[PDB]
Amino acid sequence: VQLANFPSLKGKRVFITGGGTGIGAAIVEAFAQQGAHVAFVDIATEASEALCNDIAAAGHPKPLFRHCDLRDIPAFQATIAELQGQLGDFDVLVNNAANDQRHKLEEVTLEYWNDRIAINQRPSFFAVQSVVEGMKRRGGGSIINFSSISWHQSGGGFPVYTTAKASTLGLTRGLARDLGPHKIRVNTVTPGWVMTERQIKLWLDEEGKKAIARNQCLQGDLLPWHLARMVLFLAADDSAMCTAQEFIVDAGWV
Amino acid sequence: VQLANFPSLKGKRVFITGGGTGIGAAIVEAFAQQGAHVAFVDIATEASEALCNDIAAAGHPKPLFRHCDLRDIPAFQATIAELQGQLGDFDVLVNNAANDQRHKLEEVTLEYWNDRIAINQRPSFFAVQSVVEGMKRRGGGSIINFSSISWHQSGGGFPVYTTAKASTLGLTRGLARDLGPHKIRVNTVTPGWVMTERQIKLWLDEEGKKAIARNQCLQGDLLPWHLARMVLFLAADDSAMCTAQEFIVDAGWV
Amino acid sequence: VQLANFPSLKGKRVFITGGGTGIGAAIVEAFAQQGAHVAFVDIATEASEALCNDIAAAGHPKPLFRHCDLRDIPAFQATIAELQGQLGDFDVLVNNAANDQRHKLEEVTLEYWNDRIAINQRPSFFAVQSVVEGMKRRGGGSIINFSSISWHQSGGGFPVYTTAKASTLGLTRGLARDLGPHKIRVNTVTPGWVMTERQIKLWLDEEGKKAIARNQCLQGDLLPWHLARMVLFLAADDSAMCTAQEFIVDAGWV
Amino acid sequence: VQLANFPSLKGKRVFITGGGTGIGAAIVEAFAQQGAHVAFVDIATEASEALCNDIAAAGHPKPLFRHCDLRDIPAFQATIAELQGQLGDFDVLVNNAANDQRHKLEEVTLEYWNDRIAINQRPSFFAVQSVVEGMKRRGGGSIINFSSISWHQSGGGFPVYTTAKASTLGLTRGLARDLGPHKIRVNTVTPGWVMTERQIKLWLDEEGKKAIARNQCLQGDLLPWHLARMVLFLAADDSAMCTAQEFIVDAGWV
Numbered sequence A, B, C, D: 001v002q003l004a005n006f007p008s009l010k011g012k013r014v015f016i017t018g019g020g021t022g023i024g025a026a027i028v029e030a031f032a033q034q035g036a037h038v039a040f041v042d043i044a045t046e047a048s049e050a051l052c053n054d055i056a057a058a059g060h061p062k063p064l065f066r067h068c069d070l071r072d073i074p075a076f077q078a079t080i081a082e083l084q085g086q087l088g089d090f091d092v093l094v095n096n097a098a099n100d101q102r103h104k105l106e107e108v109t110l111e112y113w114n115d116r117i118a119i120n121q122r123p124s125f126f127a128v129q130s131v132v133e134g135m136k137r138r139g140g141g142s143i144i145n146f147s148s149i150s151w152h153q154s155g156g157g158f159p160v161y162t163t164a165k166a167s168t169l170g171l172t173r174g175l176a177r178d179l180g181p182h183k184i185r186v187n188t189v190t191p192g193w194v195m196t197e198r199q200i201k202l203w204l205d206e207e208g209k210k211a212i213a214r215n216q217c218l219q220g221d222l223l224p225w226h227l228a229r230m231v232l233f234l235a236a237d238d239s240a241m242c243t244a245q246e247f248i249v250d251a252g253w254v
């Protein structure tokens, strides 16, 4: 396949949450292949360091990895500030990190609910807070926040996850209004059922394969690279007047 | 005006969050006028006790008020269990309580963000957890969760509020799937700009009046009673096959 | 099983398209049970006459039936004017009629496309045109336009039908703005897969029964009366500040 | 100002309706700049011939223009077949043509309604019918159908136009399901208020300039080229698993 080049992304400073594995890793790789200067946080140290080495080996700018638990807001904001000290002000923020662990209403404790929101919802807000003054100094920027088809499909088996994934649309739309005067675009990206290693290992069974075939309009695997292309579009000059909106990349499910 | 009677609501046990003032108080009154046995929590003791006395004086079943800060999940769940001991299992849950205090991205602390979610998002989940076993014993039930046009309009000036208000759609839709086998309906109600005393006192100015007139299709005040009628419909047998959906009562704004 | 009474509907003048069978017949019955004065058009003469006699035998105001092919706009507008001569100005319009005949892209002729639009889309516009001056004289009114979950599902096998069913949202929303100054409300009602006799006999098989069970959150038949209750609500004073919006009655499918 | 290159578009055969002026002309230019072989229809002969000469003078493959009134389905389908004879099977279809003439409910005749639908709705269906067998032979393709924020805004003053613009979503979603097995993607593109020459000269006044400033989150003109970039993305291999969805390019209005 012959994929796009976005000359406007060369030299841009890009910060990604959860960039070590899964969709995050495809977004890190896609931006580095455009010549962007990427930084990302993850807790998966071995996979993250290997990804950075592989991208450099392929001829692209080595992404800057920092180990950071996104549940620790002070450590996360300190990490973003330290990376801004290395790369300069960020142009692009990608709020990708999540965790889709299943859970039942009747078993969720206060502590578990809090932890689900600390992983899936809170980091996005503090990431925006950490990058906006630099984006104003750079004359604008683009923020991409990840939702999920899970809440669109009324998906069962993880109601705190659906809650957090729907919340992304309110974060996007409130911020689009607040930040638009500074030429900062804020959009939602909503994947379908993406065949990452995690999805194949934990959640995909024969019944899940039959649900994909019934519900997708296009047959075949939705893959991390499909999502990465939409994020590159939304970060590039090509999308300069897109804001507040939801971009669904789902092979026709919802 | 000559408003509906819903014979199916007579004798039903109804729990409402934030029922002492504003839209909550109109929902308490509307259910009591149908002959339902209402219970509600609020922190506004004087207004809440006065509301209960006024409804009894008007000839209806006296609602049971309990003072409870919804930020304290253990106290809130204990309160629901104590009220179930008085009225029996609940048939209807209305997740109404919120707080729309304005705030700027750049000024939000970790503690403030946590408190916004503790008021606007977390109580709804634990309210559902507290009532579902009783609704199964009653052979079904109806859960009504409040969103807001704020996130639909990309409203500025309160991004944690828009985040929490969008999150309601994911709580509704994940739970509709999980609880539907038990004949428990779960729907979202989304008010427009409702002229409560709070809205008139804090947020309404000449510019806000001009925004209402430009954006509403129907001129005039959207009022608490308009929202109460939609909640009664969604709790009554008349709506027995509505679930997962959003009901917007907004005079045509969004 | 104890359904609502809407005192505001007693004596109201109600016009319904396609009121002789299916969901339309349930709407005609539901309005007559509230004491409204109903008129409706259909091509199904024997079923329509039988329904009017059954309603009269149940003790309600006998609906006025007129045979009319909605494809004939002049005849249809003349029929509405003649019924306005009998009942007075209409308060409520329900645009219900449709025909969901399946068809394949590659087989649709120009004449077939035009006929599909003549049945499914064009009548609604001219129904509104015919009732609006009377609604202005009555001091307002309520218009209910039927969509379908078909377009929300990306339903295959009838692309001109999905086209016409999505078009309802644009009719509703353009007219909500144009008619709101006259206190005329305009809303969309979107049924799920309603077990009318026609749906069961034309389109239902064992696979369809499995699709209903997988996709509905609430098990059991979505029935004409469920849709009728939503239309009563939207026509009654209880919904006086609902306009422009979509009300989905689908047991949680979409 | 350094816009993307999509190598997958070089040599692709692209058919555009209404490609002579406005957004259509920007789409024609953008595809030709990528090295695609473009054909388009319009009624604006002098503007269309000029555009083809300007594109040729810029060094790109010269688009093929044919004069055709899209209201004449047989003539339109014959024109597509003749252009397929010149370029080969089409890979990409862009259903862009429309006409937003204002009109009032009370003044619309049967003939005017039919003409509005003949211009704004019917051509898209027959364009798909004319290109699909070639797209199957090419092993897939991409269809882009234009909606409008007008229906999302509940825009007044043109109810047949809002009807036709909402109808696009049902055309897109029914066909995404029917054509997905052939690897044909079908998506909706929904512009905001795009500052074409026609919009500025017909519809813009000082009030409209204030409405744009209040409603857009990003200040400044939404331009034809912004829409063109979204259409390129949806036609390129980068969007190979996008189907059934709406892509809104509106500077944050709706």
Ligand SMILES: NC(=O)c1ccc[n+]([C@@H]2O[C@H](COP(=O)([O-])OP(=O)(O)OC[C@H]3O[C@@H](n4cnc5c(N)ncnc54)[C@H](O)[C@@H]3O)[C@@H](O)[C@H]2O)c1
Pocket (backbone or CB within 6 Å): A017, A018, A019, A020, A021, A022, A023, A024, A041, A042, A043, A044, A068, A069, A070, A071, A095, A096, A097, A098, A099, A100, A119, A146, A147, A148, A149, A150, A165, A190, A191, A192, A193, A194, A195, A196, A198, A199
């Ligand atoms: N994969 C899908 O099918 C799918 C579907 C819809 C939505 N999404 C969304 O796409 C985005 C990416 O999804 P994914 O499937 O790649 O997820 P994933 O769980 O596979 O990967 C998330 C990444 O974030 C990291 N991460 C998790 N918790 C962390 C923490 N506390 N601190 C730091 N890093 C942490 C993980 O280590 C991992 O590298 C998410 O927002 C997800 O909700 C994915």
Ligand SMILES: NC(=O)c1ccc[n+]([C@@H]2O[C@H](COP(=O)([O-])OP(=O)(O)OC[C@H]3O[C@@H](n4cnc5c(N)ncnc54)[C@H](O)[C@@H]3O)[C@@H](O)[C@H]2O)c1
Pocket (backbone or CB within 6 Å): B017, B018, B019, B020, B021, B022, B023, B024, B041, B042, B043, B044, B068, B069, B070, B071, B095, B096, B097, B098, B099, B100, B119, B146, B147, B148, B149, B150, B165, B190, B191, B192, B193, B194, B195, B196, B198, B199
């Ligand atoms: N009023 C509007 O214009 C509007 C618009 C859209 C959405 N809504 C939604 O409608 C619902 C009700 O809104 P409202 O305008 O009546 O709100 P409000 O702020 O006027 O009333 C909320 C009620 O909840 C109570 N409450 C707040 N914090 C509490 C806490 N910690 N513990 C216990 N009780 C607490 C308050 O005392 C009050 O009685 C909310 O979900 C709101 O987001 C309202």
Ligand SMILES: NC(=O)c1ccc[n+]([C@@H]2O[C@H](COP(=O)([O-])OP(=O)(O)OC[C@H]3O[C@@H](n4cnc5c(N)ncnc54)[C@H](O)[C@@H]3O)[C@@H](O)[C@H]2O)c1
Pocket (backbone or CB within 6 Å): C017, C018, C019, C020, C021, C022, C023, C024, C041, C042, C043, C044, C068, C069, C070, C071, C095, C096, C097, C098, C099, C100, C119, C146, C147, C148, C149, C150, C165, C190, C191, C192, C193, C194, C195, C196, C198, C199
């Ligand atoms: N039944 C469902 O599952 C379902 C699903 C979603 C949407 N809907 C919508 O609900 C509405 C009612 O659906 P239904 O299932 O009762 O439809 P139906 O086809 O069973 O009944 C439509 C009625 O309109 C009449 N009608 C059809 N063509 C006519 C014409 N040319 N002139 C006059 N009358 C004519 C029919 O005779 C019939 O009584 C429609 O708008 C439909 O699109 C229904």
Ligand SMILES: NC(=O)c1ccc[n+]([C@@H]2O[C@H](COP(=O)([O-])OP(=O)(O)OC[C@H]3O[C@@H](n4cnc5c(N)ncnc54)[C@H](O)[C@@H]3O)[C@@H](O)[C@H]2O)c1
Pocket (backbone or CB within 6 Å): D017, D018, D019, D020, D021, D022, D023, D024, D041, D042, D043, D044, D068, D069, D070, D071, D095, D096, D097, D098, D099, D100, D119, D146, D147, D148, D149, D150, D165, D190, D191, D192, D193, D194, D195, D196, D198, D199
């Ligand atoms: N411009 C906007 O603000 C805006 C807003 C939202 C949606 N849109 C949509 O974007 C698309 C393009 O809009 P636009 O503003 O460039 O429209 P436009 O009216 O300026 O241009 C449409 C083009 O189609 C051609 N056309 C019209 N009727 C024709 C016919 N009978 N036969 C052949 N060609 C015909 C015109 O000559 C013209 O070149 C449309 O689908 C429109 O509905 C535009």
